[PDB]
């Protein structure tokens, strides 16, 4: 069950979603190449985001690194993204 | 292990990233210097060097286009003076898992004019006394440190302390 993408939840929702984006990417560098970021206004994703690596190894040490860790004041909730079709289902 | 060469720069993905900057990959290579980077010709705006053996931020060419430098996983202890004669639109700096040691390792950064946002999570800078406090005073123009918000209340107290007496004692002591 493991695979490339990790679902965050418990994200900021007053901070912008450009600005989320680019400190997603910074923050989530350090462990992979990566090949998209899903963080959208919506209320489907709200307090929500995808990050997709381009390895498995990457997401799973992600994954298990920023469990928690206190991103704009709240602690990041990390998990495994449930399969490609909920990640597609999550942004219609 | 490779040296950064022309040869590697043109070899390298070169590539629109997810927030929609041109992105140079030099990622996982062991390069121990920067240099070469004129070879670029300017034309990124975000040049990733993570997972090297960089043990010092020096020898930058003119770049004014460059915007986001990432340093991940390096072996950084010393920055150079004066980088913002070369790279004076720099806005982001992540530094997370290096090797700078004190808070005075810092001095080099004061220069930038645009640079909003710094990581040096995992380096033993991130976790001395007045930290937070002394990155708010100064680098007043810094948004983000680690991924957390300098916020306004954060500005006033930092002001306010250092301009105490035993906030400016402080000061001396870290110099």
């Known amino acids: ?82 399969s490609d079709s909920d990640i597609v289902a999550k942004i219609k | 292990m490779v040296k950064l060469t022309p040869e590697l720069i043109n070899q390298s993905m070169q590539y629109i990233n997810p927030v929609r900057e041109r992105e140079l990959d030099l990622r996982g290579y062991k390069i121990p210097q920067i240099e ?17 053996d960089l043990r010092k931020l020096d020898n930058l060419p003119h770049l004014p286009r460059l915007k986001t430098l990432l340093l991940n996983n390096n072996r950084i202890l010393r920055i150079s003076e004066g980088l913002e004669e070369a790279v004076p639109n720099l806005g982001s700096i992540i530094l997370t898992g290096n ?53 306004q209340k954060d500005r006033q107290a930092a002001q306010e302390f250092f301009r105490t007496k035993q906030g400016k004692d402080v000061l001396k002591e870290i110099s």
């Open chain 1, 1 to 82: 069950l493991p695979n490339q993408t990790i679902y965050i939840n418990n994200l900021n929702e007053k901070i912008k979603k450009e600005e989320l984006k680019k400190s997603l990417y910074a923050i989530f560098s350090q462990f992979g190449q990566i090949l998209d970021i899903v963080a959208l206004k919506t209320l489907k994703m709200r307090g929500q985001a995808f990050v997709i690596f381009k390895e498995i190894g990457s997401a799973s040490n992600a994954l298990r690194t920023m469990q928690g860790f206190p991103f704009y004041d709240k602690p990041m909730q990390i998990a495994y993204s449930k």
């Open chain 2, 36 to 52: 070469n980077l004129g070879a670029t010709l300017d034309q990124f705006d975000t040049i990733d060097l993570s997972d090297n």
């Open chain 2, 99 to 151: 090797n700078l040691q004190e808070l005075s390792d810092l001095e080099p950064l004061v220069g930038f004019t645009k640079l909003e946002t710094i990581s040096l999570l995992i380096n033993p800078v991130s976790t001395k006394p007045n930290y937070r406090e002394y990155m708010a005073y100064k680098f007043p123009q810094l948004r983000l440190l680690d991924f957390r918000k300098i916020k």
